[PDB]
Design a protein around this ligand. Structure first.
Ligand SMILES: [Zn+2]
Ligand SMILES: [Zn+2]
Ligand SMILES: [Zn+2]
Ligand SMILES: [Zn+2]
Ligand SMILES: [Zn+2]
Ligand SMILES: [Zn+2]
Lengths: 157, 157
């Protein structure tokens, strides 16, 4: 988990370039439970974190606003959404990429999903290498990526 | 492509441990067109290669045989497959792992799919690292990894 995280500097728009998870079924279908496309991060003054993302539901992408609550580890947040209860920030440079995981701490290998976010819509090979470097110590069995045209196509339905 | 490959040596039982493809839709469900699980390679006296595999098609785990005809490259075979034209053997050591891709000469990008095969139904980190470096240049938007108790389950789950 990240040390020295300044949550306020992650604010603004983001794109889901890649995602990976501990169980194939968490991401394989367009309707899979952790297939989510992050659009905005909105930190609060108190230091909580609003996550704005799109999820497929009943034929259409739908916006979800997930309130991530501050905890005693600065880069760990508590949630009650998507059947997860934690959001972990692994690393970011604030201006280019951000790596975050979600999991259900009660069954982590059934529930862990990590994403590589980028600030701009392009395939950033260096951000992906950082992502893959973070992932090799995690029990991932599926990894997906989306170029900018593919990402927009996910909700162009 | 591997060079000085000895087809007779690859004969015998194998298990599909990991899979990767250019297009998510080639592998993202059991029903997906290139989700195949290889059971046995059967080299012919004539230098061809019969490939036995399972494929979940309707409600079944269909058993399927594909005949891969020799070409004037020892590591490339012609098939008419699922909708693929070639099987390319990239690397092997006969008794641990074998790496192969399938593609269509007509439109390879929307058709490339590769697999890491192992002889024992064990997760083998060394085979998987060979696979990853074999593929680090290719634009694969889906990569899948199976566990020990999927390796021997019919159509892996
Ligand atoms: Zn709060
Ligand atoms: Zn468990
Ligand atoms: Zn590149
Ligand atoms: Zn595992
Ligand atoms: Zn629509
Ligand atoms: Zn022949």
């Amino acid at each position: 988990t990240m040390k020295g995280l300044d949550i306020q500097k992650v604010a603004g728009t983001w794109y889901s370039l890649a995602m990976a998870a501990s169980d194939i079924s968490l991401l394989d279908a367009q309707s899979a439970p952790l297939r989510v496309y992050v659009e905005e991060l909105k930190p609060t003054p108190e230091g909580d974190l609003e996550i704005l993302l799109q999820k497929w539901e009943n034929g259409e992408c739908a916006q979800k606003k997930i309130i991530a609550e501050k905890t005693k580890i600065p880069a760990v947040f508590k949630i009650d959404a998507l059947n997860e209860n934690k959001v972990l920030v692994l690393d970011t440079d604030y201006k280019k990429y951000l790596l975050f995981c979600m999991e259900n701490s009660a069954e982590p290998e059934q529930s862990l999903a990590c994403q590589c976010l980028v600030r701009t819509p392009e395939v950033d090979d260096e951000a992906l290498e950082k992502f893959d470097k973070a992932l090799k110590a995690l029990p991932m069995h599926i990894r997906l990526s989306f170029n900018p045209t593919q990402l927009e196509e996910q909700c162009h339905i």
